[model samples]
Target: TGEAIQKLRETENMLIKKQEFLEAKIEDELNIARKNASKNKRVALQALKKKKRLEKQLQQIDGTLSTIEMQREALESANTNTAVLTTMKNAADALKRAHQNMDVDKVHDMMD
Candidate 1:
């Protein structure tokens, strides 16, 4: 369980870097489109189309990152969840075994 969280976090970090690079490319595309806005409609239009597709990818990564984020969080939660649940159950069992031949009066004598 803990291992999965580690791997999931790595994947999340990798995707984060990609998102930044993708955003950087979109900025460049916008700059290219704006530079050609007045002098050349053809170049400007093509850049706009290219930028639109990049933006689509940007949207897709947002979805994928959202999914990875949720998965990572769920795994982390489950990690702690298993630890807590198992500890409680193990403690209960141990306590019961420890009291297998005990009584309230003898317990009081020990405390005294």
Candidate 2:
């Protein structure tokens, strides 16, 4: 579980970096388009179209990353509950078996 958490964290960090890089690229393209629009309308128009497409792609990536983060959280919760439930079930089973025999020494031996 610890290893899984670590891997998840690493993946999250990578996604964050990717998102930031995409944002920066989008900003750069917007700035360049503004500067070139006056001198070259066609080039600026093409840049604008490309920028819009890139923005849409980035948004999709963001949505996917959000879903992954939610999944990671769910897994973490399940990991905790699974460990607790397993321990309780084991204890219950041990007690049930002890009840089948009135011999205290048998119970003590079972505990050992």
Candidate 3:
């Protein structure tokens, strides 16, 4: 589970970088389109089309990263919960054994 989480985090990081690159590409494309809007309609249109494609890919990457983040958080939370429960169960068993042959009165007398 820990390894799985680690891999997921690595994937998440990779996707984040990809997303940043796509964002930059989209910005660049948009700028190109804007700069050529008055001078060359054909170039401006092509840039806008490229920008649209990058934007679509960026959306997909954003969704994928969101899913990965959610899964990682859930796994981490479950791991924590499992550890806590195991500790609690061990403590309970230890307490039960400590008093297995004793009573409350014995404890009181011992304290007195």
Candidate 4:
């Protein structure tokens, strides 16, 4: 679990870095478009298409982050359940002990 968590943290950091790099690249492209537009030559239609594709990819990465958050929540819930079950099992053992020590009459009375 520790290793998995560490790996995930690393991956998350890497994704963040990649997103930043991609953003910078997009900004650079937009700057170029602006320069071209000033000369009466707007960015080519193909360039616009490529920029839109990159935007879509960034949106996809945002979706991936959401999924990562959900997975983290699920893992936390599972851990909590494991702890609760362990405590419940201990309580069950105590109940069994109490039942063992009860007199026959007491057991019968309780059953009613």
Q: Which candidate comes out best when scored by TM-score?
A: 3
Q: Write the per-residue lDDT of candidate 1 for residues 15-110, one digit (tens) a residue.
A: 888899889988898999899999999999998898889889889889999999999888888888889999999999989877864766577788
Models ranked on lDDT: 3, 1, 2, 4
- Maximum-lDDT candidate: 3
lDDT of predicted model 2: 0.85
C-alpha lDDT of all candidate models, in order: 0.87, 0.85, 0.92, 0.73
Q: Please list the residue runs of candidate 1 whose C-alpha ends up more than 4 Å from where it truly belongs after superposition.
A: 103-112
Q: Candidate 1, after superposition: displacement of residue 23 in Å?
A: 0.6
Residue 99's lDDT within candidate 3 is 86
- Backbone clash tally for model 1? 0
Residues 1-112 of candidate 3: C-alpha lDDT, one tens digit per residue: 5788999988999999999999999999999999999999999999999998999999989999999999999999998999999999999999997787577657778875
Clashing pairs in 4: none
| Comparison by lDDT, 1 against 4, better one | 1
Kindly report which residue stretches of model 2 are placed more than 4 angstroms away from their true locations once superposed.
Answer: 90-112
* Model 2 lDDT tens row, 3-109: 78778777988988888988888888888799998998987888888789889989988998988798889889988989999999999999987876657667678
Clashes of each: 0, 0, 0, 0
